Write a structure and sequence with these properties.
part of a larger assembly; 2 chains; A: about 120 residues; mainly beta; four-stranded antiparallel sheet; 1 helix; 9 strands; globular; B: about 55 residues; little secondary structure; rod-shaped; Major capsid protein (chain B)
Chain lengths: ~120, ~55
């Protein structure tokens, strides 16, 4: 290459963080959000009530964990769905949260715990 | 019956149809009656209209 090397990118995270869920005829723990314009979504991110990602200073407004990879340019999620989906209550998830800069993980975890969401420690 | 509405594949939502209806009714009936009689007073000394005797 020009610099002597070339990288084509890594693989996006796969949806496997779910360990337990209230299996119900209608999704009991899954909610759907209208995607925000020009916003990239990846598995493990934390969303507010209106679909915007939680940022520093409002960790108390964490609402659900995203479990869908969304592409802003296509305005389409992988598997070709039109909406973002996240777990908003009553589930056990792997501890692989993705947080914005300066976001306190402990506050987010405490806020989500009030909704019956528990995180299982993950090894190296 | 109505039309189904599309749902998100990963959301796992769904809809359901409503039950049916049943009811009962009843009817009366109509009754008719007629009465007639014959007496000898209508036969004696009565000439047949089409004849003379």
């Amino acid at each position: 290459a020009y610099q002597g090397f070339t990288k084509l990118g890594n693989r996006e995270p796969l949806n496997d963080i779910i360990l337990w869920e209230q299996i119900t005829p209608t999704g009991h723990s899954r909610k759907e959000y209208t995607p925000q314009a020009s916003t990239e979504y990846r598995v493990g991110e934390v969303l507010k009530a209106d679909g915007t990602k939680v940022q520093a200073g409002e960790e108390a407004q964490a609402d659900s964990v995203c479990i869908v990879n969304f592409y802003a340019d296509l305005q389409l999620s992988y598997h070709g769905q039109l909406k973002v989906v996240g777990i908003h209550r009553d589930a056990e998830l792997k501890d692989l949260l993705t947080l914005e800069a300066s976001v306190d993980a402990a506050a987010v975890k405490t806020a989500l715990a009030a909704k019956g969401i528990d995180f299982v420690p993950t090894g190296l | 019956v109505s039309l189904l509405d599309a749902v998100d594949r990963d959301s796992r939502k769904a809809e359901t149809s409503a039950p049916e209806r049943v009811r009962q009714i009843s009817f009366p009936m109509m009754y008719f009656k007629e009465v007639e009689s014959i007496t000898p007073d209508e036969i004696q000394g009565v000439r047949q209209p089409g004849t003379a005797n």
